[PDB]
From Swiss-Prot, chain C:
Protein name (database record): Small ribosomal subunit protein eS6
Gene this protein is translated from: RPS6
Keywords of this entry: Phosphoprotein, Ribonucleoprotein, Ribosomal protein
Disulfide bonds: none
Annotated signal sequence range: none
A GO term, aspect molecular function: structural constituent of ribosome
Length: 134, 260, 167, 182
RNA sequence: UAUCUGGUUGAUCCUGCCAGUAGUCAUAUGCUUGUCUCAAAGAUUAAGCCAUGCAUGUCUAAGUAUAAGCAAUUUAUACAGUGAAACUGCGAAUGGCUCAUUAAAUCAGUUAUCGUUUAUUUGAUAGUUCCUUUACUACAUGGAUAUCUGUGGUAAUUCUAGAG
RNA sequence: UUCAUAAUAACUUUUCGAAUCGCAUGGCCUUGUGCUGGCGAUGGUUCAUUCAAAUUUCUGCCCUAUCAACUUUCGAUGGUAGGAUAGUGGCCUACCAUGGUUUCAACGGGUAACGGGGAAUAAGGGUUCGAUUCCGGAGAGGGAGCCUGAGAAACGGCUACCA
């Protein structure tokens, strides 16, 4: 037996964010940890809404296995999900993609450097050139 | 030290925010608004920590932005907007209307209300004066100034503001044997009748209040907010009709009304 | 390095407290007042550079300064300015005489034109009209309110002077 | 500058270290209930003392006085729930007469022993530590768990582990494997 | 959670201390140290001195784009998509750290402002700017200056001169 | 209350009373492109209020008499008028008066003193600690002085001197 008895407890219907929010309580028996993707799929099947319009986060195993408790939101449309859900979560899901920043330190340094010049530094470049030459 | 303070530490917050000790160092400081900092209730708190429609500050902000929350008809977009006593919070989606009233214990209660009551706001009178060009104005203890008031409206009198325009529709004179609500101190959240009004012309008038169960108590005049004529309030009061049980009584109630 | 400040006189460099308004300084905070060293208004044997503005043209030429012209980069932006530049008068319309710039990516031929500021739009006119209306309306409302109040006062005074009779 | 976390020292050492009789008593107690430390005993004593303090205070107040009626009553209820006080003695005056044995005879240790499942206290302790024994389908690791009287009916082996019927695991499994291809 | 015990004598009863005993969100330190949760941490001496990096910046349909920026494509022949810079606005007086000063000072509870200032906020709110009333800018006034383009100064700095 | 407020007198190097932006593109024909009109942003006057602010009342601080008199030319205590300030006030200035505090410790000295919430101990009473997560207050090497601003005598602002 694998079972995976999924439950949506504490269901708040939320029109203000176009979602349904609930505590996900899932049963394991003999199987360790449900995996998020699978859970999402299950939720989608339950609720008829698209798999990408489902979001599940913040899970903990009961201690001694058997159960997992977490938090789940099901948005009305995929568009809705896109425009209300945090970016990291979206990335995790597979919808939105990773933003490619440098390490924050580098950014800070860059900013500081920028501070040190007044205006766009094309004139400055020219000055450096010509002055360097003679 | 140097100008106004702009942060609020989590412990220094009003206790009736019901804010948890952990999960953060800071509390949402109410912005400059209609209600006093300590007597207010920021929109964020209302949204996240009461109704649970938002999970975090970002969510709350998002909710605010799509122009959906309405404090006293007017829109609002501040996360830290200080909605206080008698303020009507209307959500366009859900079609729920709320009035911010206290409960038996002290904190702000989630009090669901119909559209027929949500149209008006009830407000105490703080000041009555002639303004510029000799024009009389009334000041509500809840923010407003209303020009050309009915000239037998005095201080401490409560006023039915129609909210949609902001005009006085009707009023209650402050007098003995009139239904009252307590808005400050230990007795805050309690409903009563006004048995007697002590004066002490110099510092702080004390009003004696009896509730429905014949149980007298005394509070300062500026903590006392008229609500109607006894038995017949102008607004709907929250569950437990501002009554205050003893602890034992409360326990008994909890026990005897078990239905798990 | 040090610049020449106009007004100092003196054939030597001097320290000055410099604020917003006067040169030899760009303030980085509002009301910042750096004490900076600056060279005088008198030319000596110690200067590296003189800055010379040639006002009267002469007999001979200097290669690329008297013979040659640099085009003015930006046409006027204000409508009145535009009018002035061309010499057009008030009834002639500004839109048509706006200086165009031709930009090409390599294939796409494209034109740039300034937003004429202080131009008589219909929108502007409408706004003005609305403003005019609004104040008037407010005034009317106020008057009405005052009248009502007066009436109320009258019909309370009367009431008072009905119980002013008695024994 | 985050809000401070509350600690509380949950035991108290004796005010005189080598009181020989006392020491022997402690040892005896340990022997009885398979206690790893004197520390456990001390903890229990501390707990008892706290209760006593409350009870004494309550007594000091007038009887039928609100506070006594409430808090004392609550305490009594708690005690009954835990199973330390008996139904004969819901009194508050009897709360003072409790003594350390009644708390130790209520641990998930002793309870486990006294329902079968064990053969001596040490064995029971081992089982508890070893993640055998569940209460309400919840595997309890803690030897000093304080069984809540109504939950005492439910003490059983886990659905995981052997003993309560699952995969044998580790040593048995190894043995089986060895047997297999020979 | 009301407790004492060893030491003045050949022995005794005291006064008395010293010594032990227990605790310390009390520091140090000596040995050891498997796990879980929680987590103080350059205060004490020197409010002694500081390499280097970072810690306050900010733009929406909605103050100002002719970047000679990117767009590029089926709202522009005034602009109108994004948008670096710069002007303007606002913020930088909050936060964070530390305890040197300080003994009616600070501070705590308590009053008072009929003794004042207060960006912001949420309410309010201004037909009267005219100046004699037969031909008047109001279908909208003026001159700048930033970025930018060019000419430089200095060993150098978030130094700025000269012109357009 | 000489308050709110109103009124007469005038004054003023006459403050403010929208030459500002975005999206809407609706209603009457006197058929102009006419007159109009919606939802908003920023602004701006005084009064509110709110976040604040300066002061301010009464009562309460640890050791010390091997500190008993202290303050008052250079303001000490009070008066009058002015100046100054956001405003009250010796806050400062002029003229005048001689007060003010103190064995119920003034004043001075010390603190290895920031104050409080609190902490350790724990029959009852106490004793010791509180640089430190919250609330006040100070300070940015030391002392001054200011600019900008609603708000700073600011130091990740400036000006000087000393180190
Ligand atoms: Mg009063
Ligand atoms: Mg414009
Ligand atoms: Mg296992
Ligand atoms: Mg004692
Ligand atoms: Mg002797
Ligand atoms: Mg001897
Ligand atoms: Mg000792
Ligand atoms: Mg493990
Ligand atoms: Mg140090
Ligand atoms: Mg700027
Ligand atoms: Mg600070
Ligand atoms: Mg007056
Ligand atoms: Mg005076
Ligand atoms: Mg000190
Ligand atoms: Mg101290
Ligand atoms: Mg302290
Ligand atoms: Mg120190
Ligand atoms: Mg230093
Ligand atoms: Mg300074
Ligand atoms: Mg620094
Ligand atoms: Mg600072």
């Amino acid at each position: 037996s694998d079972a995976i008895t999924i439950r949506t407890r504490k269901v708040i219907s939320n029109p203000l964010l176009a979602r349904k929010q609930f505590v996900v309580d899932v049963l394991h028996p003999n199987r360790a940890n449900v995996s998020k993707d699978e859970l999402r799929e299950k939720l989608a099947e339950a609720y008829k809404a698209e798999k990408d319009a489902v979001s599940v986060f913040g899970f903990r195993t009961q201690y001694g296995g058997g159960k997992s408790t977490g938090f789940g939101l099901v948005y009305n449309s995929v568009a809705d999900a896109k425009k209300f859900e945090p970016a990291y979560r979206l990335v995790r899901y597979g919808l939105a993609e990773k933003v490619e920043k440098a390490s924050r330190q580098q950014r800070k340094q860059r900013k500081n450097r920028g501070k040190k010049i007044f205006g766009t530094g094309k004139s400055i470049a020219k000055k450096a050139a010509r002055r360097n030459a003679d | 030290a140097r100008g106004p303070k702009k942060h609020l530490k989590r412990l220094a917050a009003p206790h009736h925010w019901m804010l948890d000790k952990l999960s953060g160092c800071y509390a949402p400081r109410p912005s400059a608004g209609p209600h006093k900092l300590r007597e207010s209730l920021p929109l964020i708190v209302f949204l996240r920590n009461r109704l649970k429609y938002a999970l975090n500050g970002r969510e709350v902000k998002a909710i605010l932005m799509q122009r959906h929350v309405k404090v006293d008809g007017k829109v609002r977009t501040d996360t830290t907007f200080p909605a206080g006593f008698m303020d009507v919070i209307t959500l366009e989606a859900t079609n729920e209307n709320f009035r911010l009233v206290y409960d038996v214990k002290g904190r702000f209660a989630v009090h669901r209300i119909t559209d027929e009551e949500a149209s008006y706001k009830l407000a105490k009178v703080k000041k009555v004066q002639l303004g510029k060009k000799g024009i009389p104005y009334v000041v509500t203890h809840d923010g407003r100034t209303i020009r050309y008031p009915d000239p037998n409206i005095k201080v401490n009198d409560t006023v039915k503001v129609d909210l949609a325009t902001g005009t006085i529709t009707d009023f209650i004179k402050f007098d003995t044997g009139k239904l009252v609500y307590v808005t400050g101190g230990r007795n805050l959240g309690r409903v009563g009748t006004i048995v007697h009004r002590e004066r002490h012309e110099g510092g702080f008038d004390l009003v004696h209040i009896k509730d429905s169960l014949e149980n007298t108590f005394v509070t300062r005049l500026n903590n006392v907010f008229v609500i109607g004529e006894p038995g017949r309030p102008w607004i709907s009061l929250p569950k437990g009709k501002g009554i205050k049980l003893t602890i034992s009584e409360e326990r008994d109630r909890r026990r005897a009304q078990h239905g798990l | 390095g040090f610049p020449m400040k106009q007004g100092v006189l003196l054939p030597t460099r001097v320290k000055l407290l410099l604020a917003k308004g006067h040169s030899c300084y760009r303030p980085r905070r509002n009301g910042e007042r750096k004490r900076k060293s600056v060279r005088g208004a008198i030319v000596g044997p110690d200067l590296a550079v003189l800055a010379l503005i040639i006002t009267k043209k002469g007999e001979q030429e200097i290669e690329g300064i008297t013979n040659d012209t640099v085009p003015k980069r930006l046409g006027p932006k204000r409508a009145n300015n535009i009018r002035k530049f061309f010499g057009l008068t008030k009834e002639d319309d500004v839109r048509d005489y706006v200086i165009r710039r031709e930009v090409t990516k390599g294939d796409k031929s494209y034109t740039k034109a300034p937003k004429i500021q202080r131009l008589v739009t219909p929108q502007r006119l409408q706004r003005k009209r609305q403003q005019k209306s609004l104040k008037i309306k407010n005034a009317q409302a106020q008057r009405e309110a005052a009248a009502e109040y007066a009436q109320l006062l009258a019909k309370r005074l009367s009431e008072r002077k009905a119980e002013k009779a008695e024994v | 500058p985050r809000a401070p976390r509350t600690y509380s020292k949950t035991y108290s050492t004796p005010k005189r270290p080598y009181e020989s009789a006392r020491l022997d008593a402690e040892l005896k107690l340990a022997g009885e209930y398979g206690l790893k430390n004197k520390r456990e005993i001390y903890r229990i004593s501390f707990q008892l003392s706290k209760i006593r303090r409350a009870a004494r205070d309550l007594l000091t107040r007038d009887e039928k006085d609100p506070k006594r009626l409430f808090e004392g009553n609550a305490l009594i209820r708690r005690l009954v729930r835990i199973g330390v006080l008996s139904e004969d003695k819901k009194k508050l005056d009897y709360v003072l007469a409790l003594k350390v044995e009644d708390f130790l005879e209520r641990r998930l240790q002793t309870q486990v022993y006294k329902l079968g499942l064990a053969k001596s206290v040490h064995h029971a302790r081992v089982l508890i530590s070893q993640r055998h024994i569940a209460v309400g389908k919840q595997i309890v690791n803690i030897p000093s768990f304080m069984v809540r009287l109504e939950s005492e009916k439910h003490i059983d082996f886990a659905r995981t582990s052997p003993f309560g019927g699952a995969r044998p695991g580790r040593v048995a499994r190894k043995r089986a494997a060895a047997a297999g291809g020979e």
